Design a binder for this molecule. Structure first.
Ligand SMILES: Nc1ncnc2c1ncn2[C@@H]1O[C@@H]2COP(=O)(O)O[C@H]2[C@H]1O
Ligand SMILES: Nc1ncnc2c1ncn2[C@@H]1O[C@@H]2COP(=O)(O)O[C@H]2[C@H]1O
Ligand SMILES: Nc1ncnc2c1ncn2[C@@H]1O[C@@H]2COP(=O)(O)O[C@H]2[C@H]1O
Lengths: 530, 530, 530
């Protein structure tokens, strides 16, 4: 049993524990660091301190709802049932104060030095504002005065010293909400707004007890609101309902309960309640505004970027024909989602980038035969050096005769090769153009027009040269496929022809090599016919 | 004593003085610049002007609380006690006006030209709106009319000309709050909201004096609210409490004090008070919103970045299995703290970067024997060219056979070398892999799998070549340790073997050199066994 | 006179004209473009249209204040004075409608096509909502019914059709405020909030006329608020004050004028007025919040950056000793001003950058003798390739023996050279170290410790090599000064010695050259003694 107590008092492996400590070795280190001292110390992340936090929070909200109401409307406050509840909550919060001695804080590292450091820090921090609210001063002062209507007044007053149990509630709810509200966007916001409206109802309830308490301590003078409305004799449900209604009407600023307040005490209490209500309502409106702006962030940022590009198009005074094509492109590329890609892919590390890239191009590695038959290290490097692009229908991707600087891998949407003295050649998903320009270091062979809405993957020339100089068997493959494709087109490149005639006669090719090559070129005939 | 007066009037070395002036030579320059003119000039950063600011602010808030109340409810305003206070505050603000002549402003540099520049600027800026509020016009006009109920009315009016002492309060509180509120985020916000609620209570108090002042100047006509509620005879505490309650109920918009206002004067004053109250409450709600959004900034920005990466993962339609790993990585790397590292480390200078890097890697310089025994300039350069990384459990850091481009220093969490025909080899904190790939310019020797949650420090190949070409003794060390590690693994590199056989036989090695090398290789056997 | 009319109708050279048109040639182009058509067309930037805008705005706010009040409380609306004012404002707004025909809009370019384009666009845009409000329908319908208490009711109604003069006011105030409110931050904000509170007082006034208008059209039934308060006979000042007070109490939500509204008409008008008041007050609170957040921007952004660097220091868990030095550095460098320097200096062009750099370094070009005697093109290039730095007291700028990569120009604050077997050497403002390391391509000669708070200007090695390879006479100067400084230090560099012994014996030096060199080295002895 005591081993279970020690394992409870030591910090346990949890999500917050891992977020604090990093590796589990730090959790074992903290477990031994707690296991230094004997039978006493509890850690501020332990499940014992968490459950004691929760039990004391339930008891606190219970007592702060039932304390003030009990004081005002119950002029017989010496009943056995009432005294039993009072001493129960008293010994419960004395337990919580001694555990507040035997806890430990976190400045830096978590301080676990009991007899000097945490004792001095706690005795300098909150011991007065807890020791007033702990012990029942209402029975001590009563047995002192026993060892009298003014004394009955004074023992009705000092019970409100237990309202200083409030500071423990906010001091605990700080830790509790920061632990159990870091989950999502909706849940944290909704628990924060319900936190605030719970605070507002607590203040309305306290004020509703106050507006009857002060006409009670003066024994109901004949001009205050209670003896004007003639409800000194009405049963306590009616008095509490009216006092709470009066405080809620002051709080939301609707109006005075009665026509007006005439006595001086009622007048000043009404004014103080009005100030507190206006301030709390202003804070509530501010929190509602902050919650709304936190919910509406993404659409706002997208409209910011849209207004920026609209201002750019306005500054150059482009025609509306072009603005329609630009907004069509932004829709067809970003799909109404604002995000920066290079920054995120720079923030992630190498295997996360490799796994994300392999998932985004899982279709292309299957559909191209080259990627299906090549080595996975080459495939991974060539895949890592790619770039997304979106082409609108009917614009030239590659024009003939210009200098070549990249190649493109088709992912979605058919694009056509338009060679003169050739009809047309369509290219489905899973194919590539831009081979022979980069392999021959010359001018583009035949132009390419984007028929449908193409979604292409492009690869620059320097990365292509680095990868294909690392592994040259794929360069032999590209040379052979480019030879067949050029022979079908009609033009021929003697540089690549002589390089292959010196390459194939050198004997570096194998039986499996040219069998794979024959498979690839018949596959290329298939994905140029289709 | 006069030397103390001159040292008070000259600017003193303070935090604001250093933030204004840079070096202390500018403070000495300003001290001589004040010491040019004789016995007169005070500087707008001097402790004399600061203490005169504070004393005049205390006297101002005192007088603006007690002036209007004194006017309305005290129809016997010729008492000795009242006249003594009036002439006291009068001569105090005449002192402040003459010191307002003998001050100096700051446009650019601080102007200290007395007899033309600052005299012309002050006499064109605020001299009318101070000279009205300075001298007691209420006794001058009275002794003029002595040298009569309308005259008693007129001498009750002109005392409100001292409410133009208000502009000096805001004009001073600008400087005072910008001096003593640049400390932190909570303190500046709380003093700003209490500044605004102090302003609102001041307006409520002034309006509460007004609502009795205007039924007073008409000698209480039989239809205004005072003679309707029948409180012309009630003692002044009751009249002030009711007038303040009526103005506060108009201000927060709760309701008319009485059922309605019937006389025309009460009607128009009620409407003007309603407008001023609605405007001031709107400003208060705006300031509360701005304060709340200023407090809730960091969690907001973190949720912005989180929503952005969520939109990226939504756009690529990644499976939830991968989204869980990405959110796990972001938690395990940033720990819920949004900050940009490269920008901050670019903003700091060279010794701050060196000191921060040495503190972040104080454990690694002790645990690695190479760093413990090397020269501190080399250690500092190699430390400056490092980069943080976080690896999740069970992904390959380095795969075998790929091209090598960096090396890694383990900081936290064990990672394993998985070589074929070797069992496994664990590596604790404080070790490095990636030596022999960069030293032999070839393929990776054996793959490395991240067992626990690794926190690694990585170093790129170009920086490694620059540092190790600057100092080659560490390259001899790395060559020897790599030779031993390869001999234990099973593969061997003849390039490094021949380079060391030509290196060691060259005679460049020394007795201390290979003694240190023997210590390092037995240390490497220790941190590969462990 | 007609030439003055044509020059008024044509667009004039103004600040908005230059911001619209760029060069003055476009203003002359627009002047001829207006001068195409004859005697008719006015341009929407012309001073004629601006002054007609202003005169119609004055007349509009006058009429919309005096129209509704005239309708309700003046049951004798056939007086000569009243009819004269009505036909005056009628013919004034018929003038404004015909000028609304003869104007021109701006879609793109400013359309100036009169008889089809602007006529069709205006007749499709606003001609109904102006032609109702232009002509006095109240006299036309009266002379129709003349060519009867229901008819008197109907001629009291249709005058409110002139409230549709309101749309012209907002349609003009759009252009007028965007012209004359682009000046500053305070003026635009204050005119916007006073614009909104003017709109709110206009709605309060209109509602105050409505609450008496509807009990007027039913001939004051015996249960509406007017005949309950018994003010059918009170003179019109009293009725207007009470009706405006009732509408203002509904508008700000304070309370019903009377105890409650009993008749059905009063009930529904009260509810509609409550809805309009709550909506307008919500808009006012929103505009106040936006104004406050616009005023408090700079301090907010500075606190954002400060919280970010605080989160960075918290994430690395640096000691508070280091956090104090970092916050000291940020204060001493940015001086509490958030701004990005590289972005702004990238946005400006070449002579603006040259002029800004020459002003920031006007002291250094005078204090250094090299800059005073060198060619201004060299001085400008070397000045353009500089970088600011701030060094805290007591850290080593340059350590001995390390590799050299930049040189530093002292601007403010003394720094010391600490050479072994030399006492110490102080360097005032206007001096440079880092010459001989960059000139000899080797290790740093002697360390340098920052004594006071140094503000230095640094220059990198690649820019230094580019400039000093462009002009080599300054390299001869640096070689000679470095020779003297090394001879005084104690170490000597044979590379520079032999390069100068081959350089000086080559005969490239002149009499003016070595006279300038002698002046520079005695100046260097002066600024090393001092
Ligand atoms: N018949 C064809 N079928 C498919 N693609 C082709 C054909 N002819 C040329 N191409 C591709 O179109 C590209 C355009 O010019 P390049 O020189 O970049 O390389 C060319 C080939 O990749
Ligand atoms: N037996 C071993 N123990 C620890 N590390 C090793 C061992 N063998 C190889 N390594 C490291 O693992 C690295 C992986 O391949 P590299 O060529 O980068 O260089 C290798 C060495 O740094
Ligand atoms: N006696 C000296 N007085 C002033 N500066 C010096 C002196 N000796 C060396 N320096 C400077 O200090 C620099 C530090 O090393 P460098 O090699 O960069 O070049 C050195 C010179 O610019």
């Amino acid at each position: 049993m005591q081993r279970q107590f020690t394992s409870m008092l030591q910090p346990g492996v949890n999500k917050f524990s891992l977020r604090m400590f990093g590796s589990q070795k730090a959790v074992e280190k903290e477990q031994e660091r707690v296991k230094t001292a004997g039978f006493w110390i509890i850690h501020p992340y332990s499940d014992f301190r968490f459950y004691w936090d929760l039990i004391m929070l339930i008891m606190m909200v219970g007592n702060l709802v039932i304390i003030p109401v009990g004081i005002t409307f119950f002029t017989e406050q010496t009943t056995t049932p009432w005294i039993i509840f009072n001493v129960a909550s008293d010994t419960v919060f004395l337990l919580d104060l001694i555990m507040n001695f035997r806890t430990g804080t976190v400045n830096s590292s978590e301080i676990i030095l009991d007899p000097k450091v945490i004792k001095m820090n706690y005795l300098k921090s909150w011991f007065v504002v807890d020791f007033i609210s702990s012990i029942p001063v209402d029975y001590i002062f009563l047995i002192v005065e026993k060892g009298a209507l003014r004394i009955v007044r004074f023992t009705k007053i000092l019970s409100l010293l237990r309202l200083l149990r409030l500071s423990r509630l906010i001091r605990y709810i700080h830790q509790w909400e920061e632990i159990f509200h870091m989950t999502d966007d909706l849940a944290s916001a909704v628990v924060r707004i319900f936190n605030l409206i719970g605070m507002m109802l607590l203040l309305c309830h306290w004020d509703g007890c106050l507006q009857f308490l002060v006409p009670l301590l003066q024994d109901f003078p004949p001009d205050c609101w209670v003896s004007l409305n003639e409800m000194v004799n009405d049963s306590w449900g009616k008095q509490y309902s009216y006092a709470l209604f009066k405080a809620m009407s002051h709080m939301l600023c609707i109006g005075y309960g009665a026509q007006a307040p005439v006595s001086m005490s009622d007048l000043w209490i009404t004014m103080l309640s009005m100030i507190v209500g206006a301030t709390c309502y202003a804070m509530f409106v501010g929190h509602a505004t902050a919650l709304i702006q936190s919910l509406d962030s993404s659409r706002r940022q997208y409209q910011e970027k849209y207004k920026q590009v609209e201002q750019y198009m306005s500054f150059h005074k482009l025609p509306a024909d072009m603005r329609q094509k630009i907004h069509d492109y932004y829709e067809h590329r970003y799909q109404g989602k604002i995000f920066d890609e290079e920054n995120i892919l720079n923030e992630l590390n190498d295997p996360l980038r490799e796994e994300i890239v392999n998932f985004n191009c899982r279709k292309l590695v299957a559909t191209m035969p080259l990627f299906a038959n090549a080595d996975p290290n080459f495939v991974t490097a060539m895949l890592s050096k790619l770039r997304f692009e979106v082409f609108q229908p009917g614009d030239y991707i590659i024009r003939e005769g210009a200098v070549g600087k990249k190649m493109y891998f088709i992912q979605h949407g058919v694009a056509g090769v338009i060679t003169k003295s050739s009809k047309e050649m369509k290219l489905t998903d899973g194919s590539y153009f831009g081979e022979i320009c980069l392999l021959t270091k010359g001018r583009r062979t035949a132009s390419v027009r984007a028929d449908t809405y193409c979604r292409l993957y492009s690869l620059s020339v320097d990365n292509f040269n680095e990868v294909l100089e690392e592994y040259p068997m794929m360069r032999r493959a590209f040379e052979t496929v480019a030879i067949d494709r050029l022979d079908r087109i009609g033009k021929k490149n003697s540089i690549l022809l002589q390089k292959f005639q010196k390459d194939l006669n050198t004997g570096v090719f194998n039986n499996q090599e040219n069998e794979i090559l024959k498979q690839i070129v018949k596959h290329d005939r298939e994905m140029v016919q289709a």
